[PDB]
């Protein structure tokens, strides 16, 4: 099984560098070939540049070439990309992949984003199962993920036990600047009082972590 | 470093129906056709490799077609985790490009929204602000208005919404409303309301509460 990782994304002021890293597990390096593509929000995958493990071979795609470069290191697994003089343009997804002719594995994605902007780390707030009248069969509780920047915050609830009848939603950058998101599950009213549900938030980018308690009734 | 074309490149498909989504190249690419699919947040996946051929575990329903600048995805049989954006990639010049996927949308049946509102929460009034949030909850189709009457009196524009894809096994949608306005506002009012209105619903859902005293 293989595992391409890739991470070092991250908040980068308009000119700054990045590196990112793409890390492997599963199968013999030296083998296939790696490479970087890149996919802005809400749009077309892009290809950035490859190198072949055995001989350092490397094709660089011209617009990135100038600013971007690819390494490898052979000894740890890991695929490199140095990233120069960041336009906000260059804000994306960046995957790493594998082989050729077609990639058929592919990583996760790091996200980089450039803005002028700080890091905020989020608030998260308590979206309380409101009277067990109104909510008569099924109940909803969640999270509201309030104020961070930038992207991303995971959210889970009961440290991944609860799976089924979460919603996250998307996040709104709001009027701040920053951002807001939330996530809902759809529980059992009858549970209500036979079990605690905790939503647990982590937003990386300023490591931080919450797990909230999001119990019974609401406004008073 | 051909341009690679989709057409058409969003769809909407009932369960069971064909789909033929088409991608072509600029130049003669030799049947280096391959097709990846992503679901919203994820990796790509490799469909069908060299126009034709299955990747591992990829589904029966699924074929490629075509030579020179033309080829085509098929899709047989919609199945309702077909929910994706696909992409055509070239494989025979340098750089490998992509096409600017297609957006397949799986069309199924009404399905009402089940409407729920949340009071602001104590801590949130404590930072010097309220958000109110309704929720409308596993309806179809994405169309639905909300509006949100503080005292049986529209609002405007103090409300942001948000909306998810659609879900991999029964094809509906979930709408995030929040409401914001800060405490001094939220205490100086009692009734919040949010109104919803959509085509498996008769009659437009209100979902309200007491108490700009939280």
């Known amino acids: 099984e293989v595992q391409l990782v890739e991470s070092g994304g991250g908040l980068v002021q308009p000119g700054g560098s990045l590196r990112l890293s793409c890390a492997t597990s599963?199968?013999?390096?030296?083998?296939?070939?790696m490479h970087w593509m890149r996919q802005a929000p809400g749009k077309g995958l892009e290809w950035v540049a490859g190198?072949?493990?055995?001989?350092?071979?490397?094709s660089h795609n011209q617009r990135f070439m100038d600013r971007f470069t690819i390494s490898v290191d052979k000894s740890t697994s890991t695929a490199y990309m140095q990233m120069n003089s960041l336009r906000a343009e260059d804000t994306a997804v960046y995957y790493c992949?594998?082989?050729?002719?077609?990639?058929?594995?592919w990583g996760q994605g790091t996200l980089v984003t450039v803005s002028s902007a700080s890091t905020k780390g989020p608030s998260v707030f308590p979206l309380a199962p409101s009277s067990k009248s109104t909510s008569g069969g099924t109940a909803a509780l969640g999270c509201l993920v309030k104020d961070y920047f930038p992207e991303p915050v995971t959210v889970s609830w009961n440290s991944g036990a609860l799976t089924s009848g979460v919603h996250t939603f998307p996040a709104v950058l709001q009027s701040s600047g920053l951002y807001s998101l939330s996530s809902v599950v759809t529980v059992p009213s009858s549970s209500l009082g036979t079990q605690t549900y905790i939503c647990n938030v982590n937003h990386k980018p300023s490591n931080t972590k919450v797990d909230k308690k999001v119990e019974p009734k609401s406004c008073d | 470093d051909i341009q690679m074309t989709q057409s058409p490149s969003s769809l909407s498909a009932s369960v069971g129906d064909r789909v033929t989504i088409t991608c072509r190249a600029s130049?003669?690419?030799?049947?280096?056709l391959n097709w990846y699919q992503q679901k919203p947040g994820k990796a790509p996946k490799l469909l069908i490799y060299?126009?034709?051929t299955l990747h591992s575990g990829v589904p029966s329903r699924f074929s490629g077609s075509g030579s020179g600048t033309d080829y085509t995805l098929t899709i047989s049989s919609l199945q309702p985790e077909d929910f994706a954006t696909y992409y055509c990639?070239?494989?025979?010049?340098?750089?490998?490009?992509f096409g600017q996927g297609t957006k397949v949308e799986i069309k199924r049946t009404v399905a009402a929204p089940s409407v729920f509102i949340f009071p602001p929460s104590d801590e949130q009034l404590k930072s010097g602000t309220a958000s109110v949030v309704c929720l409308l909850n596993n309806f179809y189709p994405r169309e639905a208005k909300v509006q949100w009457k503080v005292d049986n009196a529209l609002q405007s524009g103090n409300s942001q919404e948000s909306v998810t894809e659609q879900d991999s096994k029964d094809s509906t949608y979930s709408l995030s409303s929040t409401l914001t306005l800060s405490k001094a506002d939220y205490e100086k009012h009692k009734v919040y309301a949010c109104e919803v209105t959509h085509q498996g619903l008769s009659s437009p859902v209100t979902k309200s509460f007491n108490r700009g005293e939280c």
């Open positions: 130049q003669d690419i030799n049947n280096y």
């Open positions: 060299y126009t034709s």
């Open positions: 190198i072949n493990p055995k001989n350092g071979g490397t």
């Open positions: 992949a594998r082989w050729r002719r077609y990639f058929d594995v």
């Open positions: 990639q070239q494989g025979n010049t340098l750089p490998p490009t």
């Open positions: 599963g199968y013999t390096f030296t083998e296939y070939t």
